[PDB]
Assembly symmetry: D3
Homo-oligomer: 133 residues x 6
């Protein structure tokens, strides 16, 4: 049994895909245990969330995108939730994400890619602490 | 207008949260605030339904409303109150119309998936209950 | 209550069996009995529709009903008879409402996808026809 | 009967083209002609809506109708005109019924996703406008 | 042209996913040629169905699960139906089943995994003989 | 940014899957820039479209199928549209096409396979020139 942190990104709001994305996770039988709506996430939380990427060329653009509209932060719980939701999410690169995955079916950009999900136990604990202190 | 919607515990039990939210999303209403409650305080539920305090079902309904999670949402849109009420459908499963949320999904007078404010005055009161900030 | 539903041969031809069953399932009705007929005996069809024996369409309708498979289902739920009738929608394609099974999917008075018992008395008779056990 | 349907520019903006066409397709109407317009000529739009020429919204509506692509479709079926009108739903978002295209998807009196001919006489006129061949 | 044996498992009934599962197979153009509904399958048929696993640690628990609610047994027919429906079904292990498959999208447990499908021509004949003697 | 040529094949019309197929591409955020409806495509355009296969045993049967009902020719535009839509389409062979893809979910034959999509930049230019001279 694990908890993982998911962000529904501003592009999901713009494209009216919030329920579609949440629905794919819900139909897999994962349970919401925490959830917050952000009309606009604080820049500092975004920069902390993506701190690994702070020295990458796309960092500033990614952070700008992430504060360009609302986000939902959700903690999902289930057996092996972290890897399972990562599999559902699909590859970052739209040339690689498989049909059937959230990104494979719905995303068409490496940056505007609809959903974040924790990639490991350690990062899940870290990310949950950021969004749900 | 702004209206107050509750996703009720039966929606969680039946894994219909995204389905309900999706019907409102597809109608182009915007989420302005949202909170997740693992279990709403009974006092909050009693206040929300204070006008039913003398009804025979009052306690049973309060028990149901604290039996599982709730999501409270403020939606915004032109004439959002009446429009979301029409999408919601009648309380009575003998009357709620196919095509409405309750008409398609609810099969009980009490366990009826969704609350929506019924007037501007009740919207103000309910938003103040669920989002006192 | 228990009611008798037929999935008609046009549902098989048009690959709408799951769609129709899904609309009833999502309303939370429980299957109590079910039988698949590769081709129903004409005599069974004539008995089912015996009250239409003098109508001009009687033979054509019987021909249609044996033209492909049927699934007969007994569904159970509070006020299941009237509720499933409302989901079914009117026989006449000029009247069946969008949101109903026939309103959304049927475009003919005869080839109309689904039968549902219209009263408690007819439910008893029809269940005895299709499930004499 | 044959009727003239327009998929309006808001359907393109909101990525609802397939959703709308799918609702008509599932009702078993057959496409007899179809044209895609990257931008319809304003004169065509003015002719289509000539009966509204004195209305206060006439110019705003024409502006909207040339603001993005349109698909014009001739559909054929028994009583196709009235049936597709019923699927379409009322112009007014305070009236369009859940289960209809506008009832489920449209939230504005002007930006209302779909046109459908309202009579046999108007169907002839509109088909001659969009498909003069 | 082949026939294969599918079981819709009790978890599909509990989670109201029966039509969803049948619909995925129906949309692939497979035809139902036999079908039976079991309110509760006999223990002996279940133990025979899973006889290969009789000495495995999970055998008793699996059999208990399989008689814990209704099942539907279906014979589907199509060209290479056996391998095709196996592909649609997805891996037993929820750490392996691919998004897009029935289990990949809907199942979250190695035991409660929604659907059985024959794994070969020989086992299909055997399983059909069990459920449809 | 690329343009690719898609054909919706006559089997999609027969099976009422036109909107389903177009919807999968639309939800991926690809934009229609040209579209034509053919009640019956001219034999010569079909033979030119498939000229690579002119000496294969299935050529005549494939061409016969392709003129057996309507087709829609669509030009879609998006970043890397050619490879992305090919991925969505899925393998020609129904023993290989992955669940989650259009063919993996919906097609059950190597010939009647619902959709064509250009396989390269060069063939896209060629095919667009054929259908949209
Ligand atoms: N423009 C651009 N943006 C990128 C690139 N790589 C990553 N990003 C953005 C989008 C990602 O969602 C986010 C975090 O990257 P990640 O942890 O490698 O990917 P992911 O766990 O979201 O699939 O940063 C990239 O290569 N280019
Ligand atoms: N068991 C039972 N519960 C009832 C009955 N009438 C109302 N309720 C419950 C369910 C309703 O969602 C809630 C509030 O009643 P309402 O304001 O008349 O209905 P609504 O605005 O949720 O459609 O109280 C009732 O008659 N019986
Ligand atoms: N062709 C034709 N068929 C008809 C007509 N009226 C009824 N039928 C057929 C289709 C109906 O499903 C069946 C039983 O008629 P019903 O009990 O009045 O309708 P329903 O309970 O299936 O809605 O007989 C009719 O007027 N014309
Ligand atoms: N802004 C605005 N637009 C309107 C109003 N009434 C009609 N329109 C626009 C939207 C309609 O689709 C179009 C044609 O009006 P109509 O023939 O009465 O409606 P309809 O046949 O599209 O349902 O003109 C109106 O009252 N206000
Ligand atoms: N708890 C548990 N149950 C298992 C395990 N392996 C198989 N089972 C159960 C669930 C399977 O649906 C059933 C038959 O196993 P199978 O033939 O290897 O899998 P499958 O053809 O259903 O994908 O037995 C297992 O490793 N653990
Ligand atoms: N009957 C039959 N038809 C075939 C076979 N290979 C190809 N075809 C038909 C169906 C294909 O859609 C069409 C073009 O073949 P293709 O370019 O290799 O496949 P595709 O780009 O449509 O996946 O010709 C084949 O091996 N057998
Ligand atoms: Mg990451
Ligand atoms: Mg109320
Ligand atoms: Mg009747
Ligand atoms: Mg009009
Ligand atoms: Mg097996
Ligand atoms: Mg090719």
């Amino acid at each position: 049994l694990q908890r993982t942190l998911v962000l529904i990104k501003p592009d999901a709001f713009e494209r009216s895909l919030v329920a579609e994305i949440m629905g794919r996770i819900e139909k897999k039988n994962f349970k919401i245990v925490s959830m917050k709506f952000w009309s606009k996430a604080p820049r500092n939380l975004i920069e902390q969330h993506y701190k690994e990427h702070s020295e990458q060329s796309y960092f500033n653009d990614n952070c700008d995108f992430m504060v360009s509209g609302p986000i939902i932060s959700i903690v999902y719980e289930g057996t092996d939730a972290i890897s399972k939701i990562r599999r559902l999410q699909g590859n970052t690169n739209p040339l690689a994400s498989a049909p059937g995955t959230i990104r494979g079916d719905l995303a068409n950009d490496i940056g505007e890619n609809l959903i974040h999900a924790s990639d490991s136990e350690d990062s899940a604990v870290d990310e949950i602490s950021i969004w749900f202190p």
